[PDB]
Amino acid sequence: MKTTLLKTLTPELHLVQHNDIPVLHLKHAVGTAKISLQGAQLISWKPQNAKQDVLWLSEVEPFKNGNAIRGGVPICYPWFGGVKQPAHGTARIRLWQLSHYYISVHKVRLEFELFSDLNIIEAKVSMVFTDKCHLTFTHYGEESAQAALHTYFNIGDINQVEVQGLPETCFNSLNQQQENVPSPRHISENVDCIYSAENMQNQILDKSFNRTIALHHHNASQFVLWNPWHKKTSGMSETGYQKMLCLETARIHHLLEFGESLSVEISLK
């Protein structure tokens, strides 16, 4: 819970150490953002006039080097979930570098890169801030890879949310079964399901904070909808599930090849 200023890059962009991990802080006309250099992980984004942060970050987040941060937009790569250990690959537990920052009147662009232990580029993340947030991940790996932008959206109450635009079926990881489903969808229990990405737009209606989080995905093959509900979840308080929902942009069954990207554009309405 201790922070220190590490570096003033510009008047609008600072590097601040949160416990063990360096985090960029952006404060600009377009709004504010925080990006952990560990995992090039956007953990806060509040566009101008938004009353609440768009992203959720665990109120008990440790900020410990090498331990995945619970919240924001973790980068799962080059494997998804627990098919191997550590779950979700190594990207989100490795320090990235800020390789470029562009600041102008109505827009801010930050680029992050991840390097192999042999000093060769492995992946890139770009983030473009306007009234919307466009985050893109590109793979420069050695083999085909899975990836996912595991976005944790901040909401007023899990009981007052509807998820618009997903298919009427999905694969339920909970019981490993394909199942039929409502659209819109509401969450009234532990949901851990993989949808085919038929249409690239879906949105999250929040009647507690009274806003809509609209999502325009690019190059997704799968969309993972997840809320742990009552399961104890490492780095989550016992009450955390009520204020978050994950709608993940993903390439799980359609792999990424060298130079292919996947991205999401986040906005409020």
Coordinates of C-alpha atoms in Angstrom, one line a residue:
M1 CA 0.0 0.0 0.0
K2 CA 3.1 2.3 -0.3
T3 CA 3.8 4.3 -3.3
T4 CA 7.0 6.3 -4.4
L5 CA 7.6 8.5 -7.4
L6 CA 10.2 6.9 -9.7
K7 CA 10.2 9.1 -12.7
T8 CA 8.4 12.1 -14.2
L9 CA 8.4 11.3 -17.9
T10 CA 6.1 14.3 -18.8
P11 CA 3.8 16.5 -16.7
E12 CA 1.0 14.1 -17.7
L13 CA 2.9 10.7 -17.3
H14 CA 4.7 9.5 -14.2
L15 CA 6.2 6.2 -13.1
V16 CA 5.2 5.4 -9.5
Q17 CA 6.2 2.3 -7.6
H18 CA 3.3 0.5 -5.9
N19 CA 4.8 -1.8 -3.3
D20 CA 7.1 -4.0 -5.4
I21 CA 5.8 -3.0 -8.9
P22 CA 6.3 0.1 -11.1
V23 CA 3.1 1.6 -12.5
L24 CA 2.7 4.4 -15.0
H25 CA 0.2 7.0 -14.1
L26 CA -1.4 9.0 -16.9
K27 CA -3.5 12.2 -16.2
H28 CA -4.6 13.9 -19.3
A29 CA -7.5 15.7 -20.8
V30 CA -8.7 12.4 -22.1
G31 CA -8.8 11.0 -18.5
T32 CA -6.6 9.0 -16.3
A33 CA -5.0 5.5 -16.5
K34 CA -2.6 3.3 -14.6
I35 CA -0.5 0.6 -16.3
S36 CA 1.6 -1.8 -14.3
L37 CA 4.9 -2.5 -16.2
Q38 CA 4.6 -6.1 -14.8
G39 CA 2.5 -7.8 -17.5
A40 CA 2.0 -4.4 -19.4
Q41 CA -1.2 -4.5 -17.4
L42 CA -3.7 -1.7 -17.7
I43 CA -5.2 -1.6 -14.1
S44 CA -7.3 1.6 -14.1
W45 CA -9.0 3.7 -16.8
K46 CA -11.3 6.5 -16.1
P47 CA -12.2 8.5 -19.3
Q48 CA -13.3 12.1 -18.9
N49 CA -16.5 12.5 -16.9
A50 CA -16.9 8.9 -16.1
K51 CA -17.9 8.8 -12.5
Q52 CA -16.4 5.4 -11.8
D53 CA -13.3 3.7 -13.0
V54 CA -14.0 1.5 -16.1
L55 CA -11.8 -1.3 -14.8
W56 CA -11.8 -3.2 -11.6
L57 CA -8.8 -3.8 -9.4
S58 CA -8.9 -6.0 -6.3
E59 CA -9.1 -4.0 -3.1
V60 CA -6.7 -6.4 -1.6
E61 CA -4.3 -6.5 -4.5
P62 CA -0.7 -7.1 -3.1
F63 CA 1.3 -5.7 -5.8
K64 CA 4.1 -8.2 -5.5
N65 CA 6.7 -8.7 -8.1
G66 CA 6.1 -12.0 -9.9
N67 CA 2.5 -12.5 -8.7
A68 CA -0.3 -11.8 -11.2
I69 CA -2.2 -8.7 -10.4
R70 CA -6.0 -9.4 -9.8
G71 CA -7.9 -6.9 -11.9
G72 CA -7.4 -4.6 -14.9
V73 CA -6.5 -6.3 -18.2
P74 CA -4.0 -9.2 -17.6
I75 CA -2.4 -10.6 -20.7
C76 CA -2.8 -14.3 -20.9
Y77 CA 0.0 -15.7 -23.2
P78 CA 1.2 -18.0 -24.6
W79 CA -1.3 -20.4 -23.2
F80 CA -4.8 -19.9 -21.7
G81 CA -5.9 -21.0 -18.3
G82 CA -4.6 -24.0 -16.4
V83 CA -3.7 -26.1 -19.4
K84 CA -0.1 -25.7 -18.0
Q85 CA 1.4 -24.1 -15.0
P86 CA 1.6 -21.3 -14.2
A87 CA -2.0 -20.7 -15.3
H88 CA -2.4 -18.2 -18.2
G89 CA 1.3 -18.2 -19.2
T90 CA 4.2 -16.0 -18.3
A91 CA 3.4 -12.7 -19.8
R92 CA 1.4 -11.3 -16.9
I93 CA 4.2 -12.1 -14.4
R94 CA 7.2 -10.7 -16.4
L95 CA 8.3 -7.0 -16.5
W96 CA 7.7 -5.3 -19.8
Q97 CA 9.3 -2.1 -21.0
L98 CA 7.6 1.2 -22.1
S99 CA 9.1 1.5 -25.6
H100 CA 7.1 4.5 -26.8
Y101 CA 4.7 7.2 -25.6
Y102 CA 2.9 9.8 -27.8
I103 CA 1.0 12.6 -26.2
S104 CA -1.3 15.0 -28.0
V105 CA -4.4 17.1 -27.5
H106 CA -7.0 14.5 -27.8
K107 CA -5.1 11.2 -27.6
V108 CA -2.4 9.3 -25.9
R109 CA -0.6 6.3 -27.2
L110 CA 1.7 4.0 -25.0
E111 CA 3.5 0.9 -26.4
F112 CA 5.0 -1.8 -24.3
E113 CA 7.3 -4.6 -25.3
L114 CA 8.2 -8.0 -23.8
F115 CA 11.6 -9.6 -24.5
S116 CA 13.0 -13.0 -24.3
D117 CA 15.9 -13.9 -22.2
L118 CA 18.0 -13.9 -25.5
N119 CA 17.1 -10.1 -25.9
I120 CA 14.8 -10.7 -28.9
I121 CA 11.2 -9.2 -29.0
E122 CA 8.5 -11.6 -27.9
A123 CA 5.3 -9.5 -27.8
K124 CA 4.0 -6.0 -27.9
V125 CA 1.0 -4.2 -26.3
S126 CA -0.3 -0.8 -27.5
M127 CA -2.8 1.3 -25.7
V128 CA -4.6 4.3 -27.3
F129 CA -6.6 6.6 -25.0
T130 CA -9.3 9.0 -26.3
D131 CA -12.8 8.8 -25.1
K132 CA -12.3 5.1 -25.7
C133 CA -9.5 2.7 -24.8
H134 CA -8.0 0.6 -27.5
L135 CA -5.7 -2.1 -26.3
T136 CA -3.9 -4.4 -28.8
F137 CA -1.7 -7.4 -28.1
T138 CA 0.7 -8.8 -30.8
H139 CA 2.6 -12.0 -30.8
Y140 CA 6.2 -12.3 -32.1
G141 CA 6.7 -15.7 -30.7
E142 CA 8.3 -18.9 -31.8
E143 CA 5.3 -21.0 -32.1
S144 CA 1.6 -20.6 -32.5
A145 CA 0.1 -19.2 -29.3
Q146 CA -3.1 -18.6 -27.4
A147 CA -3.7 -15.2 -25.9
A148 CA -6.5 -13.4 -24.1
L149 CA -7.1 -9.9 -22.8
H150 CA -8.7 -10.9 -19.5
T151 CA -10.6 -7.7 -18.9
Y152 CA -12.1 -7.0 -15.4
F153 CA -14.9 -4.5 -15.8
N154 CA -15.9 -2.4 -12.8
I155 CA -19.6 -2.5 -12.1
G156 CA -22.1 -1.3 -9.3
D157 CA -23.6 -4.7 -8.5
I158 CA -23.3 -8.1 -10.2
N159 CA -27.1 -8.4 -9.7
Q160 CA -27.9 -5.4 -11.8
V161 CA -25.8 -6.2 -14.9
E162 CA -26.9 -7.5 -18.4
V163 CA -24.5 -8.8 -21.0
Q164 CA -25.8 -8.0 -24.5
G165 CA -24.7 -9.4 -27.8
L166 CA -23.3 -12.8 -27.0
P167 CA -24.5 -16.1 -28.7
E168 CA -27.3 -18.2 -27.2
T169 CA -25.0 -21.0 -26.6
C170 CA -21.5 -21.4 -25.1
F171 CA -19.2 -23.9 -23.7
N172 CA -19.4 -24.2 -19.8
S173 CA -15.9 -24.8 -18.4
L174 CA -17.5 -25.4 -15.1
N175 CA -18.8 -28.8 -16.0
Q176 CA -17.2 -29.1 -19.4
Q177 CA -20.4 -29.0 -21.3
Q178 CA -21.8 -27.1 -24.2
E179 CA -25.1 -25.3 -23.0
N180 CA -27.8 -23.1 -24.2
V181 CA -28.1 -19.5 -23.0
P182 CA -30.1 -16.2 -22.9
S183 CA -29.2 -13.0 -24.6
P184 CA -29.0 -10.7 -22.9
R185 CA -27.5 -12.7 -20.1
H186 CA -27.5 -11.8 -16.4
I187 CA -25.3 -13.3 -13.8
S188 CA -26.8 -15.0 -10.8
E189 CA -24.2 -17.5 -10.1
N190 CA -20.7 -18.7 -10.9
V191 CA -20.2 -18.3 -14.6
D192 CA -17.1 -19.5 -16.5
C193 CA -18.0 -19.9 -20.2
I194 CA -16.4 -19.7 -23.6
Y195 CA -18.4 -18.3 -26.4
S196 CA -17.5 -18.4 -30.1
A197 CA -16.9 -14.8 -31.2
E198 CA -19.6 -14.6 -33.9
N199 CA -20.1 -10.9 -33.8
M200 CA -17.3 -8.6 -32.6
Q201 CA -19.4 -6.3 -30.5
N202 CA -21.0 -7.0 -27.1
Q203 CA -21.8 -4.7 -24.3
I204 CA -22.3 -4.7 -20.6
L205 CA -25.3 -3.0 -19.2
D206 CA -24.9 -1.7 -15.7
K207 CA -28.1 -0.4 -14.0
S208 CA -26.3 0.0 -10.7
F209 CA -23.7 2.6 -11.9
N210 CA -26.2 3.4 -14.7
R211 CA -23.9 3.2 -17.7
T212 CA -23.1 0.9 -20.6
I213 CA -19.7 -0.4 -21.3
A214 CA -19.5 -1.0 -25.0
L215 CA -16.9 -3.4 -26.5
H216 CA -15.6 -3.6 -30.1
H217 CA -13.2 -6.6 -30.3
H218 CA -10.9 -7.3 -33.3
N219 CA -9.5 -10.7 -34.3
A220 CA -11.1 -12.6 -31.4
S221 CA -12.1 -16.2 -31.9
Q222 CA -13.5 -16.8 -28.4
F223 CA -15.1 -14.5 -25.7
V224 CA -14.8 -15.8 -22.1
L225 CA -17.5 -14.5 -19.7
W226 CA -16.5 -15.1 -16.0
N227 CA -17.6 -14.2 -12.4
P228 CA -16.3 -16.5 -9.6
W229 CA -19.4 -15.6 -7.6
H230 CA -18.9 -17.6 -4.3
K231 CA -15.7 -19.5 -5.0
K232 CA -12.8 -18.3 -3.0
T233 CA -10.4 -16.8 -5.5
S234 CA -6.8 -15.9 -4.7
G235 CA -6.3 -12.1 -4.4
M236 CA -10.1 -11.5 -4.2
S237 CA -11.9 -10.5 -1.0
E238 CA -15.0 -12.4 -0.2
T239 CA -17.1 -9.6 -1.5
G240 CA -15.1 -8.8 -4.7
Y241 CA -17.3 -10.7 -7.2
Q242 CA -20.1 -8.2 -6.6
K243 CA -18.3 -5.3 -8.3
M244 CA -16.6 -7.0 -11.2
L245 CA -17.3 -9.0 -14.4
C246 CA -14.8 -10.4 -16.9
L247 CA -15.6 -10.3 -20.6
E248 CA -12.4 -11.6 -22.1
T249 CA -11.2 -10.9 -25.7
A250 CA -9.6 -14.3 -26.7
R251 CA -7.8 -16.5 -29.2
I252 CA -8.1 -19.9 -27.5
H253 CA -9.0 -22.4 -30.3
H254 CA -7.9 -20.2 -33.2
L255 CA -4.1 -19.8 -32.5
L256 CA -2.1 -16.7 -33.1
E257 CA 0.8 -16.8 -35.5
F258 CA 3.9 -14.5 -35.7
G259 CA 2.7 -10.9 -36.1
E260 CA -1.0 -11.5 -35.6
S261 CA -2.8 -9.3 -33.1
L262 CA -5.9 -9.3 -31.1
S263 CA -7.5 -6.2 -29.6
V264 CA -10.4 -4.6 -27.8
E265 CA -11.9 -1.2 -27.9
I266 CA -13.6 -0.1 -24.7
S267 CA -16.0 2.8 -24.4
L268 CA -18.9 4.1 -22.2
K269 CA -22.4 5.1 -23.2

